Amino acid sequence: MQRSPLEKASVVSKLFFSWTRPILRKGYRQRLELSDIYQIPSVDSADNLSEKLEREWDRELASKKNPKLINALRRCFFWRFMFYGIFLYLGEVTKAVQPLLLGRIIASYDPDNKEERSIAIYLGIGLCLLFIVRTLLLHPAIFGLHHIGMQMRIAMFSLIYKKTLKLSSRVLDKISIGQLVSLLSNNLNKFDEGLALAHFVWIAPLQVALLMGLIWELLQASAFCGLGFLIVLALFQAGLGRMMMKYRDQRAGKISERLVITSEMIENIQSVKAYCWEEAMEKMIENLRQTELKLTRKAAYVRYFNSSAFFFSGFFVVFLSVLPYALIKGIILRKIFTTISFCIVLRMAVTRQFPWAVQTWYDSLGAINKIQDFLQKQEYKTLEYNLTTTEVVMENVTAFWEEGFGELFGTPVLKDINFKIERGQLLAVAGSTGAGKTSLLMVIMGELEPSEGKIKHSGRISFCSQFSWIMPGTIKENIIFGVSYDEYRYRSVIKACQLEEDISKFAEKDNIVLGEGGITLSGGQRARISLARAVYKDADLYLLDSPFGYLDVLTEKEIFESCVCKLMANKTRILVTSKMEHLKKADKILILHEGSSYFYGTFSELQNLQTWNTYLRYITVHKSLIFVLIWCLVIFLAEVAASLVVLWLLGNTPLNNSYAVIITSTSSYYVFYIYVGVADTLLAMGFFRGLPLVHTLITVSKILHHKMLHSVLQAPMSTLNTLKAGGILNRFSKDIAILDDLLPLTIFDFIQLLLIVIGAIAVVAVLQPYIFVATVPVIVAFIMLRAYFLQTSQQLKQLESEGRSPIFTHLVTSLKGLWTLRAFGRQPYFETLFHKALNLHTANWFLYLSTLRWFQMRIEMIFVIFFIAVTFISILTTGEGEGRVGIILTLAMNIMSTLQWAVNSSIDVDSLMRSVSRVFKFIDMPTEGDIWPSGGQMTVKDLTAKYTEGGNAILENISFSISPGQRVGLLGRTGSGKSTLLSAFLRLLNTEGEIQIDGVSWDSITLQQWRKAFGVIPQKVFIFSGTFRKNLDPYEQWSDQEIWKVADEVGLRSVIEQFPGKLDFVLVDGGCVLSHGHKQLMCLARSVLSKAKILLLDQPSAHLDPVTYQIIRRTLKQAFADCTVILCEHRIEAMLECQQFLVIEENKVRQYDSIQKLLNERSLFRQAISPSDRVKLFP
Ligand SMILES: Nc1ncnc2c1ncn2[C@@H]1O[C@H](COP(=O)(O)OP(=O)(O)OP(=O)(O)O)[C@@H](O)[C@H]1O
Ligand SMILES: Nc1ncnc2c1ncn2[C@@H]1O[C@H](COP(=O)(O)OP(=O)(O)OP(=O)(O)O)[C@@H](O)[C@H]1O
Ligand SMILES: CC(C)CCC[C@@H](C)[C@H]1CC[C@H]2[C@@H]3CC=C4C[C@@H](O)CC[C@]4(C)[C@H]3CC[C@]12C
Ligand SMILES: CC1(C)Cc2c(sc(NC(=O)c3cc[nH]n3)c2C(N)=O)C(C)(C)O1
Ligand SMILES: [Mg+2]
Ligand SMILES: [Mg+2]
């Protein structure tokens, strides 16, 4: 990491921006190098800006009665804000005095021997000094304001991330990820570039006042008559402004809902492919875009008029100003031209510098109000009493989930519970699915607050959750979790939890980079990592929320008899389980039922009791766009043609005529200048040209989004495991929102300005030849410098754009596994780990932003250097009568001002066109590519299974056969590959060989027609945000009578009726409202509905007790009558059902007929069988 070159630089280097020079010549030749990226300055790091504003915000909360975040921002930015403002004012004031000096220098060409001839050279010196001071005065202040804006945004982002870690469990149901992602995604680049525009609120009026006097000098009455039009027009723009911000708050609700559905489906696509929900998910996201794009088009139509009230305004402000003066006194051309030159600045001042400033003040204060509202929310309170005898006591506790019933006090999830726990003994928390075993642990931790009751234990606590959580990094970084490493401790934990088997099979033994959630690992490997993280942590109380769900009986007994009773057996460790073997060794038991203590005591008592290609693939998506652009061009040619014959007639005039005074001298070199100043309205796009162009460009972004979401869904599994969660979420959030909002209007201004310059040069050139030759040296200079800059700029804009993914990826896992962070107390780790993501983004963004003003300053310096050269060549070579050299040259240099503005607009288009480039990389991803399943007999031959292309083979030379309508058991040790065998049939991972069914093979049929044969219950359950009927069938094939008919057999009768809207209750936060057992029953009903003659069950019973498991065999015997069943399951009770058994080990299979034979070979596995389950197998 090289340190920032801004730190050690002369004022000249910081004034002329020479310190950014190295990376351009480095980036021009070569591809950009990671070494060449500079470390952020010490001023604008995450830590200090957090430090600074954190200190002010609590001072603000302490002092005032109703605090405001703007007051906290004021005390740390206001002086450095206003310091740049006064330079930006003087830099803008010097534009208004330019027509006074230049005006006379144009007038001095007139042969009528005026006094100007005399002063011209002094204006010549003065006007050169005038340009030099502005070029220096403006750009440092803009960079200064961008630099302050960047510091404000980093400070607020840091305060949101600290606030969200202390946020209440009550609030998490209300605020989804789409709320947080959208808030950051909106502000990320909009807030920084805004503070350049923000000052023109108070610059523009003083500018209007200063200009109105200078016009009042020329025209006494009419100038006010003109101004009235701009007051008339300014109120119309303010009307569009308030209209456009009411269309944006209707849409803002819709965007959040789209991101939560898009995130959820791509996070667990492996289920989405198994069920075959492509059309279902696409049609769902399609319906959310309908409302969004309706509001986008409406907000875009009002935005055009706001950005089209400057070009049209031009002609009418001058016309209404000169007309009244013309009728009474008469006018000289020298008076009309002067007015034109003042007018252009005034409109710039009042029609694109005033409506862009206020619009920035609304958005900034709106964004700050949402952040301030987000900071003032219900916090997770902590109340831990270190002083204790280490006796975990609970007495007379009740608890409700929601606020309403709890506050008004629906049945509470706990009531009338009480227990006493000495230090060095484990509690056996037992009961049926929906007893409140997770809820009890949530009360012990303090996530769920009890209405009536009291809890007390010491602050130190460990927590192994039911849904296992894996942060992004190495298995080591997961197991130790933000603390020092201890060789003796870490190794002893891994042998206790016995991951030694699973860790040794990996290529990189200890440390492999796991993704967001850890889908590289199976269910058993995640559970034991979560348990290892819990065990490696040291605390007074260990909470274990059923870690033996996904484990086989051999692993379950060894890990129980190796960790729970060996590694920790001198402390209070409440556990969740439902087996006799675990309750025997346990000292105290608590059997919950319907949120009530059925029993409490001991085991003995209980028995007693009972680039060109990017710019070309974006124009040829939609045919309307190419018709509209051709339609604009033919109308453009017509007005260029119309103006040419107007100026032909006007110039060729043979001229009491007070109306407009002209002489042979003045005529020739004012008539052309008048046209150049009024060529911004004549060659303007109307509501015939501008409307459809905006309409089509939004239609392009709708088509691009459809293709992108379509391509991501049907791409192969390897390409989707390669990329992160935040990388997916970044594009659909930020990159698709740029094609909807900014990019359609950014192209409009670029085309408008480009047409004005082309058409201006065209009419001037055809009528007077040498001005085209005069423009060419300045034209080539701008194109030269532009081509040079874009080589570095395009490479910085990709490192910066892809630099966003760290911030989002981190924000997902932070919010996803929030309960474990506060359990272990690892906020200081995650805050400092989050600061690195901001510093990374700042490092790239600051670099790109600073490179731009270099370009912005250099192109103005080029224009100044040429204008200085033109002015003295003009003034010095002026004849005794009628100097023609200056007449030709200054006309060109009036055009180059409009082109300078167009080149700056061109760089804003290329920066936004990067986004469309990054969308097209997702569109260009590879594709995975009588009655048929009558009986459902499978024949596998020479099968091989591996995830990565040319990696390690998980299964090797697999072959076996199932006869029709036969139930088949599948089993083996955790991490054997059982899922891989189920994924091999669906062929989600790439395989070799053939699996032929009912005498017909893979290659005979398409893949989507193939996957409709099977009926899947996956290991990881997927419940998207919607109604129960939407989850149970997205296609809406089955009736309510049908779904209610299924709902009783699998037993969601009592589950659904609990909630208000029966089959209309909108599930949230990935179905957090339902318990873990109900999610397994949800996937069962989903498979029961889909009548399939083959069906695949990946551990249907995960954390179901023996009572709930009767439903599984009830529905498996009755509903699945004739169809063949592959049952992948750990519990031995399930083996009584199915005939043939498939055992997996050593990357190969073995098939067995009877159970007696199979269990006979293996002794340790037969000795793991429960005594209650041993009397069933053997009679
Ligand atoms: N966030 C929540 N909001 C509202 N109700 C909830 C929430 N979480 C759980 N519940 C309800 O509380 C009851 C008990 O939940 P809990 O998860 O503690 O049961 P459990 O015994 O742990 O389930 P399982 O045996 O499947 O692990 C369930 O009926 C469930 O509907
Ligand atoms: N997506 C993947 N990419 C790479 N390797 C994988 C992937 N999924 C699984 N593996 C590897 O394959 C091994 C076995 O895979 P699989 O997920 O089928 O185990 P399993 O039998 O389902 O486990 P469990 O018994 O816990 O359900 C894992 O131990 C892991 O090393
Ligand atoms: C800083 C600004 C807002 C102050 C007010 C505007 C200034 C520019 C205005 C207010 C009064 C104006 C003056 C009013 C009358 C005359 C006399 C005339 O023969 C030459 C111009 C001159 C001298 C004007 C120059 C511009 C002027 C000085
Ligand atoms: C904002 C807007 C309504 C934009 C606008 C105008 S005026 C105008 N077009 C015309 O005059 C016109 C004439 C022929 N074809 N178009 C527009 C517009 N965008 O078309 C004004 C009034 C300044 O203000
Ligand atoms: Mg539970
Ligand atoms: Mg599995």
Domain coverage including residue 480: 392-609
E strands, 670-710, in order: none
CA of 208, nearest ligand number: 3
Distance CA 879, CA 885 (A): 9
Minimum CA distance residue for ligand 3 atom 10: 213
Residue 430 sits at φ, ψ, to 5 deg, of -120, 160
Distance, CA of 901 to CA of 856 (rounded, Å): 10
> Side chain identity at 84, as an amino acid letter?
Y
Ligand 4 contacts CB of residue 686 (under 6 A): yes
Q: What is the CA radius of gyration of the chain?
A: 37
Question: Which strands sit side by side in the sheet containing 991-997, from one edge to the other?
Answer: 955-962, 938-945, 991-997
Residues 1038, 1015: Cα–Cα separation, whole Å: 16
Residue recorded with tokens 């082309």: 758
Q: Is ligand 4 within 6 A of the CB of residue 312?
A: yes
Cα of 1129 vs centre of ligand 6, distance in Å, is 9
Measure 949 CA to ligand 2 centroid, in angstroms.
Answer: 16
**Structure-derived torsion over alpha carbons of residues 94, 95, 100, 101, reported in degrees to the nearest 10:** 70
Work out the burial of residue 346: count CB atoms within 10 Å of its CB; fewer than 13 is exposed, 13-18 middle, 19 or more buried: buried
Cα(1070)–Cα(1018) distance, integer angstroms: 16
816 is in an annotated binding site: no
465 labelled as ligand-binding? no
DSSP letters of 173-186? TT--HHHHHHHHHH
Pull the structure tokens for residue 693.
């162009």
Nearest alpha-carbon partner for 378 in 170, 161, 165, 162: 170
SS (H, E, C) 353-383: CCHHHHHHHHHHHHHHHHHHHHHCCCECCCC
Q: Which residue from 1094, 1121, 1156 is spatially nearest to 938, judged by alpha carbons?
A: 1094
Burial 182-211 (b: 16+ CB within 10 A, else e): bbbbbbbbbbbbbbbbbbbeebbeebbebb
Of ligand 2's listed atoms, the one at least distance from the Cα of 978 is: 21
- Structural contact between residues 960 and 1124, judged by C-beta atoms closer than 8 angstroms: no
Neighbour count for residue 821 (Cβ, 10 Å): 20
- Tell how many helices (H) and how many strands (E) occur in the chain: 50, 18
- The answer to whether the CB of 900 falls within 8 A of the CB of 859 is yes
Q: Which residue in the block uniquely carries the two structure tokens 């227990």? A: 419
Task: Please tell me the distance from the alpha carbon of residue 627 to that of residue 693, in angstroms, as a whole number.
Answer: 10
**Local structure of residue 38 (DSSP, 8 states):** B
Which ligand is the nearest neighbour of the Cα of 506? 2
Question: Judging by DSSP bridges, how do beta strands 588-593 and 575-576 pair with one another?
Answer: unpaired
The environment of the single-atom ion ligand 5, i.e. residues with CB closer than 5 A, is 437-438, 466
- The Cα 873–Cα 866 span in angstroms is 10
How many residues are given for the chain?
A: 1179
| Amino acid (one-letter) located at 718 | S
Q: Determine the 3-state secondary structure of 941 from DSSP.
A: strand
Query: 704 with 916: CB under 8 angstroms?
Result: yes
Q: Is the CB of 550 under 6 A from ligand 2?
A: yes
Nearest Cα residue to atom 12 of ligand 4? 686
Ligand-binding annotation for 1004, yes or no, is: no
- Residue 46 and residue 69: Cα distance in Å, rounded? 18
Q: Which amino acid is residue 815, in one-letter code?
A: L
- CB contact at 8 A, 53 and 156: yes
CATH number of 448's domain? 3.40.50.300
1081 CA → ligand 5 middle, Å: 14
How far is ligand 3, taken at its centre, from the CA of residue 214, in Å?
A: 6
Measured from CB, residues less than 6 Å from any atom of ligand 3 are 206, 209-210, 213-214, 217
Helix, strand or coil, per DSSP, at residue 118 = helix
Ligand 4, residue 313: give the atom nearest the CA. Answer: 23
DSSP codes, 1023-1073: --SS-HHHHH-TT--S-HHHHHHHHHHHT-HHHHHTSSSTTT----TTT-S
Q: Which of 798, 830, 994 is nearest to 915 (CA)?
A: 798
Is 975 one of the annotated binding-site residues? yes
The CB of 325 under 6 Å from ligand 1? The reply is no
675 is in an annotated binding site: no
Q: Are 561 and 497 in contact (CB under 8 A)?
A: no
Element (H, E) at 1088: helix 1076-1089
Cα(898)–Cα(683) distance, rounded to whole angstroms? 13
Alpha carbon distance 90, 957 (integer Å) = 80
